[PDB]
Write a protein that binds this ligand. Structure first.
Ligand SMILES: Nc1nc2c(ncn2[C@@H]2O[C@H](COP(=O)(O)OP(=O)(O)O)[C@@H](O)[C@H]2O)c(=O)[nH]1
Ligand SMILES: Nc1nc2c(ncn2[C@@H]2O[C@H](COP(=O)(O)OP(=O)(O)O)[C@@H](O)[C@H]2O)c(=O)[nH]1
Ligand code: ALF
Ligand code: ALF
Ligand SMILES: [Mg+2]
Ligand SMILES: [Mg+2]
Ligand code: NA
Ligand code: NA
Lengths: 340, 330
């Protein structure tokens, strides 16, 4: 559970408090948090980014096509590094609990291979995963295969159309935050992630550009012009990232060492020092945290109005008396908490 | 620029000159900033193409090599000769900017350049902008379609060798060059894959599987190359040092030593030279047939024989000339 992001203890406490408040005054819950979806070209580093957001390794990563089926991860808050209060469970394996996240990765691989073989095949049938933990939100993440241009192995001629439709079904909804993942060692104008995001989200009200592989850029080049909004501007801006390379994947490098390595990388290069606070996985997590806090606080006006109307009605109305006065006190406490 | 073992091989030029006494054009296709201009200029052997990150090439450049025995000429600047190739590069930049501004605009209107040298062939090369996905600057929403059509106009012809340029630091299945080449040349009988930026690949990864033909096979195969990075461009590094650097890179990397002879710009030049020689030797059947028929006709006439005198002379001269030509062929 990493502080200052989407698993922020403060944010989880806030959501739980507000949920209990609403469930103590007969008011339906309006908190409809968006799902976070990664979209981009093949091997652009989407699974790496998503697992970095989660904070524990559990997604299959590697060169070529690795993710070949949508993985719909369902974070589940559960009142109480193989922990016991935390685990994952698959829908196609009901009843089974996965406390070892390495076993979750292994099961994702096995389930994928069992349905799309081991020859680059693809399927839109999602792998549904629930992760229970007392330190997460009721949030939905989505990992997707990367878009390609030339088919390989069992792939049909229209593989691009299939992958594109598979992604569009997940990013077409207005309540979805699009992580458009682009490799930094590629010109930004070639980004499939930005292309698709702009296709669904032209106004950029829910698209975050994530520039991966910045440690693999040609010597003397940087992404500073993009961050400043000088090439292809994004309302929500860009975030550079340094995930684990292929050598690190083969060596099963832990996530913590990789995050420290990213921190050092951005603290040492002359082009990113002056803006190091705006670099790395932590800043992407902070952007997502701010967006979620925005979505929560945007529901405070109508809730205040509803509570005011209910209080006016109940006060005009006044075992029934005791319950009603308790409800009046509860409504006032609810208004107070909605204020803080 | 008179480099042996490529498209400017002196023996090949001598052969062409012998034969006279319709080569295909070479077109580069690939994603933006994939290194197409670098590959093309290395094939030619002299620096004269604008290079750099972002969008640099924004208009087709139709370079026409012309053999001449004792410089550059632009269509929009008639009469001016460019002996200094740096000025050729500057003029390409200026002419591009004169029609598409300086904000990434693009146009299919080509810049026509002729380079005369006694060490070149009568050949046509074409440099093109790279395909993109998102518009930039003044570019319209359909910039991708416009660039795609601009390229198709040049690679749809059957007499075109397609250098499909793919950066090696990108998965091959994302290659725009291969997609387009297969779109026009599905049988791959005239497509050569060129893998650039091999010096920027993630540690532990290589293109050994691609060269071996295990991912996306190409009849004519793949060639890895190491062009000048942006740091080299800024320092105006000469071509000789850059090519030596490519040679050393492939002579030292653990994955390519055992096959260094099949890597680099020299090997791509050798491939193109063999393709051109094939196209030349493909013109030998009809020439032999025509010479044989002409010889039969003239020999019949001579056997038959003031007009008779100056016709017998003509026929004997034509017989000698046809025999000399038929021997040149052999
Ligand atoms: N060096 C480096 N390699 C990266 C980075 N991000 C991704 N990669 C590599 O990119 C390849 C594909 O990564 P992955 O996360 O599986 O991409 P996906 O196919 O889009 O899910 C792997 O070899 C990763 O090591 C990065 O920031 N730096
Ligand atoms: N290090 C390195 N950089 C390369 C290589 N090939 C291309 N580049 C860089 O890629 C960028 C764009 O190159 P360019 O030839 O102009 O590509 P074009 O837009 O397709 O014509 C420049 O910064 C080049 O230095 C290569 O093999 N190695
Ligand atoms: F393995 Al991928 F996009 F190439 F998840
Ligand atoms: F400058 Al380019 F393809 F990006 F020639
Ligand atoms: Mg993946
Ligand atoms: Mg170019
Ligand atoms: Na991949
Ligand atoms: Na470029």
């Amino acid at each position: 559970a990493q502080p200052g992001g989407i698993s922020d203890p403060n944010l989880i406490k806030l959501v739980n408090k507000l949920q209990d408040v609403f469930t103590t005054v007969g008011v339906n819950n309006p908190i409809d948090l968006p799902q976070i979806v990664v979209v981009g070209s093949q091997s652009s580093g989407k699974s790496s980014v998503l697992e970095n957001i989660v904070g524990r390794d559990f997604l299959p990563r590697g060169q070529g096509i690795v993710t070949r089926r949508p993985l719909v991860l369902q974070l589940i808050n559960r009142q109480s590094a193989a922990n016991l209060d935390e685990w994952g469970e698959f829908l196609h394996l009901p009843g089974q609990k996965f406390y070892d996240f390495n076993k979750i990765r292994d099961e994702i691989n096995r389930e994928t291979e069992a349905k799309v073989g081991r020859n680059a095949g693809i399927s839109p049938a999602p792998i549904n995963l629930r992760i229970y933990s007392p330190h997460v939100l009721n949030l939905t993440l989505v990992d997707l295969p990367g878009l390609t241009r030339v088919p390989v192995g069992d792939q049909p001629r229209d593989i691009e159309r299939q992958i594109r439709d598979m992604i569009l079904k997940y990013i077409q909804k207005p309540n979805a935050i699009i992580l458009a993942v682009t490799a930094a060692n590629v010109d930004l104008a070639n980004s499939d992630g930005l292309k698709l995001a702009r296709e669904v989200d032209p106004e950029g009200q829910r698209t975050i550009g994530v520039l991966t592989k910045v440690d693999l850029m040609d010597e003397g080049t940087d992404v500073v012009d993009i961050l400043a909004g000088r090439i292809i501007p994004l309302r929500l801006g860009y975030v550079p990232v340094v995930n684990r390379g292929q050598r690190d994947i083969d060596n099963k490098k832990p996530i913590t060492a990789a995050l420290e390595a990213e921190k050092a990388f951005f603290e040492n290069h002359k082009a990113y020092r002056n803006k190091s606070a705006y670099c790395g996985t932590p800043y992407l997590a902070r952007k997502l945290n701010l967006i979620l806090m925005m979505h929560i606080k945007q529901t405070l006006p109508d809730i205040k109005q509803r509570i005011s109307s209910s209080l006016q009605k109940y006060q005009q109305e006044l075992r029934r008396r005791k319950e009603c006065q308790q409800m009046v006190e509860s409504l006032q406490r609810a208004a107070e908490i909605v204020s803080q």
